[PDB]
Design a protein around this ligand. Structure first.
Ligand SMILES: [Zn+2]
Length: 46
């Protein structure tokens, strides 16, 4: 068919894990952090 929505990154840098976009080097280096653990749902209340 025909696609378009795809392609939501216009930065000279991108995470080699998810594919995020960052117009800064540091932002990326630090970003990796996200891929350090995993959200713990556990016994939720709200
Ligand atoms: Zn990432």
């Amino acid at each position: 068919g025909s696609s378009g929505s795809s392609g939501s990154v216009e930065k000279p840098y991108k995470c080699e894990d998810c594919g995020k976009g960052y117009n800064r080097r540091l932002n990326l280096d630090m970003h990796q952090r996200v891929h350090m653990g995993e959200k713990t749902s556990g016994p939720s209340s709200g």
